[PDB]
Amino acid sequence: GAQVSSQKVGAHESTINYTTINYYRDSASNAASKQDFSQDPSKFTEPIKDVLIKTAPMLN
Amino acid sequence: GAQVSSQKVGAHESTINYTTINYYRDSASNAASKQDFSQDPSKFTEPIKDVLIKTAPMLN
Amino acid sequence: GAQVSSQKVGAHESTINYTTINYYRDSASNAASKQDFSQDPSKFTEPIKDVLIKTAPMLN
Amino acid sequence: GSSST
Amino acid sequence: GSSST
Amino acid sequence: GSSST
Amino acid sequence: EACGYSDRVLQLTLGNSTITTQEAANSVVAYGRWPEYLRDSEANPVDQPTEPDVAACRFYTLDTVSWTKESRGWWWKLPDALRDMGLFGQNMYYHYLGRSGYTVHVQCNASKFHQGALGVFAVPEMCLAGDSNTTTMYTSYQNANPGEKGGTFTGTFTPDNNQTSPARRFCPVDYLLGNGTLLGNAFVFPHQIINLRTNNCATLVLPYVNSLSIDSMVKHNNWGIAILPLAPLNFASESSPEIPITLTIAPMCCEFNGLRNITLPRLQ
Amino acid sequence: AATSRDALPNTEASGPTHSKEIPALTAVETGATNPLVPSDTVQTRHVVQHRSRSESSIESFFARGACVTIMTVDNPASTTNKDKLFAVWKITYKDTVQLRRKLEFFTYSRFDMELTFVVTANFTETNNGHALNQVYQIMYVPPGAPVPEKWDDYTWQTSSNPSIFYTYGTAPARISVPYVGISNAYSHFYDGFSKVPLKDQSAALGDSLYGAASLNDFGILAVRVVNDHNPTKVTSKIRVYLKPKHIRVWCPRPPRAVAYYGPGVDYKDGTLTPLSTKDLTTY
Amino acid sequence: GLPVMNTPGSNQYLTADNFQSPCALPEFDVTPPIDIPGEVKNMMELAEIDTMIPFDLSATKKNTMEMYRVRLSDKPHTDDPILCLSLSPASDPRLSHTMLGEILNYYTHWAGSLKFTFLFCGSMMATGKLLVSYAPPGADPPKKRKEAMLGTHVIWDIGLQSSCTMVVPWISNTTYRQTIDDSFTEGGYISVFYQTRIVVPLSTPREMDILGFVSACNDFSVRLLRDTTHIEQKA
Amino acid sequence: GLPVMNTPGSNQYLTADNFQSPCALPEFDVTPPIDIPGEVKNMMELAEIDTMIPFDLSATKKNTMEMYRVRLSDKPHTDDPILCLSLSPASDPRLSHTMLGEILNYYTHWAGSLKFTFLFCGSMMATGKLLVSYAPPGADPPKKRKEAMLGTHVIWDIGLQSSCTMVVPWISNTTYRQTIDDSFTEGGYISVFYQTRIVVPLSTPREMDILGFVSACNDFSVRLLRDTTHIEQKA
Amino acid sequence: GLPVMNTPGSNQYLTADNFQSPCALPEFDVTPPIDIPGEVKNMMELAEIDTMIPFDLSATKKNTMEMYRVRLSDKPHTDDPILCLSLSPASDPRLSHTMLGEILNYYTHWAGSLKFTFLFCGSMMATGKLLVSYAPPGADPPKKRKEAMLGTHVIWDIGLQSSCTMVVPWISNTTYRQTIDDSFTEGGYISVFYQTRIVVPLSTPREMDILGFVSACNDFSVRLLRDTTHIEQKA
Ligand SMILES: CCCCCCCCCCCCC/C=C\[C@H](O)[C@H](N)CO
Ligand SMILES: *C(=O)CCCCCCCCCCCCC
Ligand SMILES: *C(=O)CCCCCCCCCCCCC
Numbered sequence A, B, C: 001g002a003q004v005s006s007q008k009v010g011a012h013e014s015t016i017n018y019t020t021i022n023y024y025r026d027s028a029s030n031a032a033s034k035q036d037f038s039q040d041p042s043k044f045t046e047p048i049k050d051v052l053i054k055t056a057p058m059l060n
Numbered sequence D, E, F: 001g002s003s004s005t
Numbered sequence G: 001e002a003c004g005y006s007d008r009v010l011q012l013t014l015g016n017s018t019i020t021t022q023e024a025a026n027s028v029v030a031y032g033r034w035p036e037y038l039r040d041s042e043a044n045p046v047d048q049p050t051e052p053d054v055a056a057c058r059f060y061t062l063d064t065v066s067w068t069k070e071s072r073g074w075w076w077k078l079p080d081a082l083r084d085m086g087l088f089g090q091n092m093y094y095h096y097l098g099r100s101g102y103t104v105h106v107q108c109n110a111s112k113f114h115q116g117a118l119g120v121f122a123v124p125e126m127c128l129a130g131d132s133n134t135t136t137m138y139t140s141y142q143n144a145n146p147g148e149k150g151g152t153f154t155g156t157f158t159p160d161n162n163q164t165s166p167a168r169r170f171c172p173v174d175y176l177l178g179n180g181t182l183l184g185n186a187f188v189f190p191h192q193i194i195n196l197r198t199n200n201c202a203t204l205v206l207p208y209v210n211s212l213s214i215d216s217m218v219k220h221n222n223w224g225i226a227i228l229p230l231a232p233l234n235f236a237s238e239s240s241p242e243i244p245i246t247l248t249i250a251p252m253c254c255e256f257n258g259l260r261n262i263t264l265p266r267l268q
Numbered sequence H: 001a002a003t004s005r006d007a008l009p010n011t012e013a014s015g016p017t018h019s020k021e022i023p024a025l026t027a028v029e030t031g032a033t034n035p036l037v038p039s040d041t042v043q044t045r046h047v048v049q050h051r052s053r054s055e056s057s058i059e060s061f062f063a064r065g066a067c068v069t070i071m072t073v074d075n076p077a078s079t080t081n082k083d084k085l086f087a088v089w090k091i092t093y094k095d096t097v098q099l100r101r102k103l104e105f106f107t108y109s110r111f112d113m114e115l116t117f118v119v120t121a122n123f124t125e126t127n128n129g130h131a132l133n134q135v136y137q138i139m140y141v142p143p144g145a146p147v148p149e150k151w152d153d154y155t156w157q158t159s160s161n162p163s164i165f166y167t168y169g170t171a172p173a174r175i176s177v178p179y180v181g182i183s184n185a186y187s188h189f190y191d192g193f194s195k196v197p198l199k200d201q202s203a204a205l206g207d208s209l210y211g212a213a214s215l216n217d218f219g220i221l222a223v224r225v226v227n228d229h230n231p232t233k234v235t236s237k238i239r240v241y242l243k244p245k246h247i248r249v250w251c252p253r254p255p256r257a258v259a260y261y262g263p264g265v266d267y268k269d270g271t272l273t274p275l276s277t278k279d280l281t282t283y
Numbered sequence I, J, K: 001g002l003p004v005m006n007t008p009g010s011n012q013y014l015t016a017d018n019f020q021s022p023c024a025l026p027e028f029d030v031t032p033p034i035d036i037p038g039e040v041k042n043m044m045e046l047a048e049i050d051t052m053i054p055f056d057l058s059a060t061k062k063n064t065m066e067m068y069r070v071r072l073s074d075k076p077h078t079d080d081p082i083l084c085l086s087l088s089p090a091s092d093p094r095l096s097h098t099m100l101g102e103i104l105n106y107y108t109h110w111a112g113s114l115k116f117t118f119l120f121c122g123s124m125m126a127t128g129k130l131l132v133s134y135a136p137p138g139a140d141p142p143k144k145r146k147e148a149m150l151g152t153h154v155i156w157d158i159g160l161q162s163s164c165t166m167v168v169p170w171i172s173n174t175t176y177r178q179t180i181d182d183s184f185t186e187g188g189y190i191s192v193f194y195q196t197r198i199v200v201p202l203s204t205p206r207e208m209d210i211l212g213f214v215s216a217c218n219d220f221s222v223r224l225l226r227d228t229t230h231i232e233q234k235a
């Protein structure tokens, strides 16, 4: 049940990996993976009904 | 001898699993798996000799 | 070098197993396996030269 | 080795 | 056994 | 590796 | 059924005895388990069991009691209530060990103008509370075991103040089910209700229940039968109505081990 | 194959009805509970049910250590007139009330028992003397084995009895024990006696307590401070926590509604009125 | 030795933990189980059984057999309540001690549908129509049939099928309600009214009791285990 | 280091534990075993061997050779007991010090069948029939042949086969009995009676001894190891 | 037991650690998520939203609505600044409390391009050309259009497209700048000038406001999490 993931190696001395085994039944007990996703800011930066083309006039 | 089971993941950050190894000869020393079964309440809620059909009269 | 054996499961909540690894060179350092054998009591209960048939007279 | 549930 | 990410 | 009893 | 069969009309036959009823409310099989003989995989005493079959697995009728507006309720213990019943009782007292299931049939008819409702409960290990606040767990064997006459519930706890010669009997308070738990919850035990407008009887089929496969019937009661008026007897405008309650109980799949001379208990 | 953590049934959408099917009408005399669901008596929408009964499985309901006793011991100056106190406790879940009430929702049970021991100590006299770190011996003395009469007598050798030597200030001690009953299940209630009174025998001779089976059901724990007497007296307490692991239960019972009064089901006068005043037509 | 680094939580005793520990009685010969009747696998099974409601907790009726009896009579039709009850299954004094109420007091949160079944215990000759109501929270609690009619209800016709059930469907803002009196997670109002009136012939009792039962539906669940207030041990 | 978290039970010494530990004499040249006769693999093997019962623990006979001798005589037939004994193999004073009784006092629980074998030590010319009885518990303990006859029994005819065995079959309510005197787990009554009488010709001793032995059957077992009360060390 | 050797760091509590620990509420029934609108995955998403700049923090205008209003008028052309601002997004008092500035105060380091957008809030009849400037650091901060012209700039023509954006491109010696006032990691100068002048017809307001907004570009990032000075709890 071991999970093997790669580290993003910053300062250097192949891929360096690290290992993780969950010891508990409850997922709440797990550490944080930090394997997170990004999204586009559009729902906040461009919430307009008609798609914005930045080279065009915003008002036409 | 490792046992690998899945966690029911509640709050999220695939299947997340966890690992279990029993360290002792006596099953009494084992932790609780919590992998438990449910049953129908009928032996207490419907202990009648003739099967009950809920849309029908209980007395006929 | 892991040894995997089964537990005789007494109270219940497949075969449940447990794992054992010996950490030392000397067998004297090992835990007790408790995987023991039984024998027939005859060398103490029936040490007679002529085999005893229990339905027959012990003296003939 | 490994059991899986 | 082992997962790999 | 692993023995099994 | 189109050929006339009904939930309300039943016939039960065990040994040389038959019960009929025309106003049943179906019948209950406690925990969905019908009585059975002890299986070899669960067996414990190794001697050949005695299994009296029809000689003991038949309907025995106990003494009829009377329901009135002041009735607080009645109780019996099994096998105790049947200890003097024909060859069942004999088999019981001659053997160290015994196990048995039961068909319990409570009988109480009245009329379309009467009203009232009896809760009929079968309780596994029906431990009742004693009359004492000077000594706990003090109810004597003789008082714990009334035989067929049974015992009664009371609406009032009254502590035995005679310290010199204590009564040593139960004081089972009705809303506390005689055991310190609320009567409204007794329905989690196998039960039926005799509600006079609806039915004139209760039928409970009880499996042998215990933490052992077989045990001392003389030392230990497996089941308790508790009958309490959930709704009081009432009729027309009479101030003092009465209707009888009769218990008929049949042992089922009973077997006994450890035969010796007969037990002669101190019952008074 | 239905597991404790499975989602409960979905609500199925249901519309208006006008028929001879009568789910709402029933007859509780039969001894049965009417198995209805909302779509039987009202119009429902479709709902995908995610909730589960995982936390109310018998295992989960009991999966907690409960305190069942507090044992007191000490280690006095050698010069004291009073004997060094060692403790003896008859193992039971009935000296406290909370775990007892939970187990008593059922008539019978089977389980492996986990015992955890929390140990605390303090000074008693307004002294200024110190004491070095104490080691405690928790010995299980099963029915039949010699119970200790003195903090230091031969029984504390434990050649065969299991003992825990606990060091103060370390993690609380813990052991497990299998289902050790002499019956196929533990009886939370025993409607009987351990003796039959015979006519040919005196009443005293045939007598025994109501509802009591083996006088020494499970034996005792005997606890001592192993350290020799110290000029300054220290008193300690060992709190015992019981957790039923791997549990099975049979025959449900109404819960205890009035205060416990002894190891039996007896009740005390003046404690029999749990319920409070509330008017029939008042919300 | 294997290089190890002790983390927070080390040496604590959490009473809800789930670890292995050494067996004090190794190789013990365990007695096998037998098939005892009545095994329970989940506490909600017990909550699905009907237990009887102590509706009438008046000063003289409480803590007596009478508390379970709701008295009806053949009086002329009224639009006034036979009984009024709050849907607070763990905390309303009439529900909190039923088997359902009791199990709910070992948990912080409850959810799902419930059902109330009433049993008419008058004579066969007695007839009647009653209205059983459930009003979800947020308006004036029904004190007159006119309001109760507007909510969830069953009009009960008394007859051979002795009993009648009203299902209180899970209708809530929150995904779980609290097992205490709480305005934010309030459940609403249960009430019973005369729809026509109880009618009896001559030579018949003019007053009678109905009994009421509550139980959980198959969609009912609880969570966050906790200690109950329904037992204590002062000293 | 590997992140680790110390659990309860840490650093305790449980005397029944089963862990590895470092060897103080590494690479030691162990002397090999040889095949010594009489190896034992299980304590119940010893319990299956017949050892002799100290039946007569009277004030003058106890702790002397005489305690093992049960005296019979050629007196006229009586229905009165030669001996009476309780089936409490670890606690009845006549059984508790037999090899079976001794091993049982290192355990809390016993189960299984037992057997009693009696040896007639009179002269060849002496004849007799005796009745050996086992009454399971719960009735008046047999004091007359009439009662003892009704339970488990063997009628022993004295002759060339010198000895006779009565098997006490496992008949119990509980799955295991306690190794102390306990009413709930009581075993019942062992007793011996004259069936006819001992008869001798002239020139023959009119009194003689029988000896008795107890041993376990192959279905016999014990559990829950414990310390015995049969040895101590005061000071 | 497995031979282990405790390493440095053992038993410490690092508040930034990431270890497993026992669950105090095992088998708890978690309420599922629903699809709530507005989920955020990264704090820089918030930094990419335009928030309004409190440009005019004069003693009378600060901490009032007026601080956000930059007043322009139709006065004759001048080469003197409408506003001057330091590119110190976490520490210059005009930028530090914008949403960008606020998020930057939870981090030690920032990097990437930014953008300033100005909104003309005069009447439709008002016209004008303005010059928006960014001077990278190291020379005299621009106080006259003549200098500001020589750096990065946008000449804004006022008209139907109400607003105009100047991008401050990432131009830095270091790979990340500090989120405090620091000469070594200074960012340079933002300023606005009149390119021609605001012109209005008659019957028209001669003074009006422009509003300004700042937001991060898609190449913008922060690092080294830290506590902010923008909140405290004295006592
Ligand atoms: C070194 C410490 C070892 C401790 C060993 C404890 C062994 C004794 C186990 C006792 C089991 C108690 C179970 C609870 C009570 C019973 O359920 C009821 N009274 C019915 O039999
Ligand atoms: C998947 O996990 C299979 C590989 C197992 C590797 C060794 C596990 C190390 C110890 C984990 C103990 C269990 C934690 C409760
Ligand atoms: C099955 O268990 C084979 C895999 C073994 C994985 C590593 C075991 C980790 C240490 C267990 C030590 C033994 C416990 C007594």
Ligand SMILES: *C(=O)CCCCCCCCCCCCC
Pocket (backbone or CB within 6 Å): C001, C002, C021, C022, C023, C024, F001, F002
């Ligand atoms: C056989 O042992 C191969 C599998 C190895 C499993 C992991 C071993 C766990 C740590 C043991 C350390 C060595 C003990 C001295």
